[PDB]
Amino acid sequence: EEVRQFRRLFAQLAGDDMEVSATELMNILNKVVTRHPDLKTDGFGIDTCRSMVAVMDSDTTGKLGFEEFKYLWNNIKRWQAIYKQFDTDRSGTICSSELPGAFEAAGFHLNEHLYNMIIRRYSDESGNMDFDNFISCLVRLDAMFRAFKSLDKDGTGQIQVNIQEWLQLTMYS
Amino acid sequence: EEVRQFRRLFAQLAGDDMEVSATELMNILNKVVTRHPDLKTDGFGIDTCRSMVAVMDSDTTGKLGFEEFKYLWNNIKRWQAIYKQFDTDRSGTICSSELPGAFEAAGFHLNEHLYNMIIRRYSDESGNMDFDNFISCLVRLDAMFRAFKSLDKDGTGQIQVNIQEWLQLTMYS
Ligand SMILES: O=C(O)/C(=C/c1ccc(I)cc1)SS/C(=C/c1ccc(I)cc1)C(=O)O
Ligand SMILES: O=C(O)/C(=C/c1ccc(I)cc1)SS/C(=C\c1ccc(I)cc1)C(=O)O
Ligand SMILES: [Ca+2]
Ligand SMILES: [Ca+2]
Ligand SMILES: [Ca+2]
Ligand SMILES: [Ca+2]
Ligand SMILES: [Ca+2]
Ligand SMILES: [Ca+2]
Ligand SMILES: [Ca+2]
Ligand SMILES: [Ca+2]
Give resolution in angstroms. Answer: 2.0
Contact B47 A47 (CB under 8 A): yes
Which chain A residues are closer than 8 Å to B113 by Cβ? 164
- What is the spatial distance between Cα A134 and Cα A122, in angstroms, rounded to a whole number? 7
- What is the spatial distance between Cα A95 and Cα B138, in angstroms, rounded to a whole number? 32
Amino acid at position B163, single letter: I
Backbone angles phi, psi at B42, to 5 degrees: -85, 0
Number of domains making up chain A? 1
A98 annotated to bind ligand: yes
C-beta of residue A41 within 8 angstroms of C-beta of residue A76: no
CB-ligand 1 contact for A29 (6 Å cutoff): yes
- Flag whether residue A165 sits within 8 Å of chain B, measured between CB atoms: no
Whole-Å CA distances, B20 to A132, B13, B14, B73: 24, 7, 5, 12
Determine whether B27 is exposed, middle or buried from the number of CB atoms within 10 Å of its CB (0-12, 13-18, 19+).
middle
Amino acid at position A5, single letter: Q
Q: Which approach determined this entry?
A: X-ray
Size of interface A-B (CB pairs under 8 A): 112
Q: Looking at ligand 1, which atom is closest to the CA of residue A13?
A: 21
C-beta of residue A151 within 8 angstroms of C-beta of residue A162: no
CB-ligand 1 contact for A31 (6 Å cutoff): yes
Helix (H/G/I), strand (E/B), else coil: B32 = helix
In angstroms, what separates the C-alpha of B6 from chain A's closest C-alpha? 27
- The residue segments making up the domain with residue B87 are 1-173
- Flag whether residue B76 sits within 8 Å of chain A, measured between CB atoms: no
Which chain B residues are closer than 8 Å to A42 by Cβ? 46
Amino acid at position B50, single letter: R
Q: What is the CATH number of the domain that holds B116?
A: 1.10.238.10
Paired with B161 in beta bridges are A159
The residues, any chain, with a CB within 8 Å of residue B59's CB and separated by 6 or more, are B65, B68
